[PDB]
Amino acid sequence: HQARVSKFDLYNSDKLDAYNQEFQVSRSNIKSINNNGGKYNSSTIDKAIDGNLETHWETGKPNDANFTNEVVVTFNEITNIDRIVYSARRDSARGKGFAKEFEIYASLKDEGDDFNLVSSGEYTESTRDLVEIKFNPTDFKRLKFKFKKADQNWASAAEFMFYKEDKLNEKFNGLFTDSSMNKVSEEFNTLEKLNAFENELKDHPIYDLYKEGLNNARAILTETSENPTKATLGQITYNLNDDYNNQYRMPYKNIKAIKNNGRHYAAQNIEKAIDNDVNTYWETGTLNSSSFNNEVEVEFNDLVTLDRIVYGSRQSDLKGFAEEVYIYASRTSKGDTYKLVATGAHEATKGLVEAKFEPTEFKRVKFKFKKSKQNSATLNELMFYKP
Ligand SMILES: [Ca+2]
Ligand SMILES: [Ca+2]
């Protein structure tokens, strides 16, 4: 009887309409609405189900020590619903009156106080989010939403939206064994199982959103064992060789994203490590310690086979130079799926250094500063070469 609550990310997708077409209770099925605490001004209760996120209902009576705001939606006919998507008001006072704690009750008739509890839940992350509240699929003629706790008490609702059960969605959420998404569930643990699943999924409205995870599972099933090599590191200048770059350097355009685990100092942000300028650099905000190592992750648009990583520090004084480097590969777009491919060391030097290791396929690369000059970490450039 505990609701599973999460941010409703689908909001920002071009698959939304198509998704709503199949799973949203349509507006022509929502008959009427009322609520026990009136309205403030002309933030009327119809504005809670008017289909427009930019209009809201606000109560005229705030939650106090002795009053709980509730809203009751009547459907045109009995309707099987498993999820509510809800936001608080989204204007100047964004988030005010969010239902931090709520309960959902069903009735199968049009009148009377015969409500039975369907679900309870909380959300503490933010009050400004559009949230998906998921429970056992239940029949409703009337649905009651109680504002058990309402941020700053003046309960509000941009919208309530209602969804039927999405069984293929629920199945897809069982693709992996846990949230680190690094192990395929037994259900899907062969390429043939996975293909069957994908085929099962092809006509679904958000099919294209499931492709990534399916591809991730495919890469995990076909992964080889970790077997890292001692990389060779030396000073190089072939990066100056434009013609050679055209043939052997991975285009900067193949970088999807870069992040790092230690924030940054001042104006030395992480993008400066990949701007094809040896004079700009990223510098961490967090020192290497007994408990911490600086790590940089780069994700690629398209898988790429590389045999060399080229890198440098800030050139002024070589502060943060990677004196010892661990290189990891992942063939997935996300999940804890990195395996160690190489390790090597080099004394701090001006200019750029290559780490050469065995040809490896990368969807993402992690670059770990195992040991670093003055325990800092900087990158003027980070470049990727093919065999
Ligand atoms: Ca609205
Ligand atoms: Ca740079």
Side-chain angles (χ1 to χ4, degrees), residues 2-10 12-60 62-99 101-108 110-127 129-148 150-166 168-191 193-201 203-229 231-252 254-255 257-387:
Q2 291 297 309
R4 172 166 54 67
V5 188
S6 60
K7 291 174 89 168
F8 177 71
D9 280 321
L10 218 56
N12 284 325
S13 165
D14 51 287
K15 301 295 183 176
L16 184 57
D17 291 352
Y19 189 84
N20 296 337
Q21 269 287 114
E22 216 209 318
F23 298 105
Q24 188 172 243
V25 169
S26 67
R27 261 210 290 170
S28 85
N29 197 21
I30 299 150
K31 205 191 182 159
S32 64
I33 190 171
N34 57 47
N35 76 291
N36 64 352
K39 63 222 156 61
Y40 183 85
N41 222 281
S42 53
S43 312
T44 57
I45 187 84
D46 61 305
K47 301 176 163 173
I49 52 157
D50 70 356
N52 175 2
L53 270 166
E54 308 319 335
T55 64
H56 70 266
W57 160 74
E58 174 167 31
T59 188
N63 274 26
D64 63 31
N66 286 114
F67 177 84
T68 304
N69 279 280
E70 69 183 39
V71 168
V72 188
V73 168
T74 306
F75 299 100
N76 190 78
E77 82 194 13
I78 300 202
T79 309
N80 199 257
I81 300 165
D82 90 317
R83 296 170 280 166
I84 292 168
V85 174
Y86 158 82
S87 161
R89 56 191 302 172
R90 288 164 46 90
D91 63 343
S92 319
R94 175 80 177 248
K96 179 174 200 190
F98 183 83
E101 279 179 40
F102 57 81
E103 297 169 358
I104 300 155
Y105 300 76
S107 187
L108 285 169
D110 272 347
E111 307 218 298
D113 175 34
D114 68 0
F115 286 88
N116 65 287
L117 177 70
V118 189
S119 184
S120 327
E122 44 175 42
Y123 188 91
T124 46
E125 204 40 47
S126 181
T127 65
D129 290 333
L130 175 70
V131 295
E132 172 180 318
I133 308 155
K134 153 65 203 168
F135 45 76
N136 281 12
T138 309
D139 285 347
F140 296 85
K141 188 57 159 80
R142 279 184 302 157
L143 189 154
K144 176 184 297 205
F145 187 100
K146 268 197 204 201
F147 282 77
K148 216 64 171 99
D151 174 66
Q152 301 168 255
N153 292 314
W154 284 86
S156 86
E159 280 296 286
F160 302 85
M161 295 165 261
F162 304 97
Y163 288 81
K164 308 214 172 56
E165 196 196 18
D166 180 354
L168 293 176
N169 193 56
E170 274 326 310
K171 198 173 179 193
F172 177 95
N173 289 355
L175 183 47
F176 304 95
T177 58
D178 60 46
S179 69
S180 66
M181 288 182 104
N182 63 350
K183 191 174 150 48
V184 185
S185 302
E186 208 191 317
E187 193 177 351
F188 303 112
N189 69 7
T190 66
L191 297 172
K193 281 167 181 183
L194 196 62
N195 289 334
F197 189 32
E198 170 151 18
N199 174 73
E200 203 192 359
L201 279 171
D203 287 331
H204 193 290
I206 56 167
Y207 170 49
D208 295 338
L209 303 203
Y210 295 140
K211 271 163 181 174
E212 195 190 1
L214 296 166
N215 285 327
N216 297 350
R218 215 157 256 125
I220 296 163
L221 294 179
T222 59
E223 197 43 79
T224 65
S225 67
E226 187 175 83
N227 184 29
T229 62
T232 296
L233 273 73
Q235 176 99 276
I236 68 83
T237 54
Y238 55 71
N239 63 294
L240 298 173
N241 180 345
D242 181 69
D243 185 47
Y244 181 81
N245 286 342
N246 282 343
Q247 269 151 305
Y248 288 91
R249 191 166 63 193
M250 187 201 81
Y252 278 80
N254 192 57
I255 293 177
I258 180 157
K259 56 187 213 185
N260 70 299
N261 64 340
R263 298 180 315 104
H264 75 282
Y265 178 62
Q268 310 304 140
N269 60 296
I270 182 78
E271 294 78 0
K272 299 179 156 153
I274 53 164
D275 60 6
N276 194 14
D277 179 349
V278 300
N279 294 283
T280 70
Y281 59 98
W282 160 79
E283 174 172 331
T284 186
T286 315
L287 283 182
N288 268 15
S289 64
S290 278
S291 57
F292 185 79
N293 273 99
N294 278 275
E295 273 168 29
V296 170
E297 299 182 35
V298 181
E299 317 185 10
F300 301 127
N301 289 312
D302 289 322
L303 277 299
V304 64
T305 291
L306 305 171
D307 72 338
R308 298 159 285 161
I309 295 170
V310 163
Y311 76 90
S313 61
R314 94 191 190 176
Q315 288 304 286
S316 65
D317 58 1
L318 309 181
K319 182 167 154 165
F321 184 95
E323 293 169 347
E324 181 178 19
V325 184
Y326 282 23
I327 300 167
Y328 304 77
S330 173
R331 285 164 63 249
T332 77
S333 57
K334 62 186 183 200
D336 294 316
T337 54
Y338 277 111
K339 86 191 173 183
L340 182 60
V341 297
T343 68
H346 197 284
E347 207 193 273
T349 174
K350 266 163 154 56
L352 304 170
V353 165
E354 77 172 11
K356 195 189 169 133
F357 48 85
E358 285 310 289
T360 298
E361 169 168 274
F362 290 89
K363 176 69 181 164
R364 304 180 277 155
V365 53
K366 179 180 288 156
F367 179 105
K368 187 193 216 219
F369 288 80
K370 175 60 170 208
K371 181 196 303 79
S372 70
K373 191 172 196 296
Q374 298 155 250
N375 287 330
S376 194
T378 64
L379 282 177
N380 68 335
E381 281 300 306
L382 186 66
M383 290 169 181
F384 303 97
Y385 284 79
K386 296 175 278 181

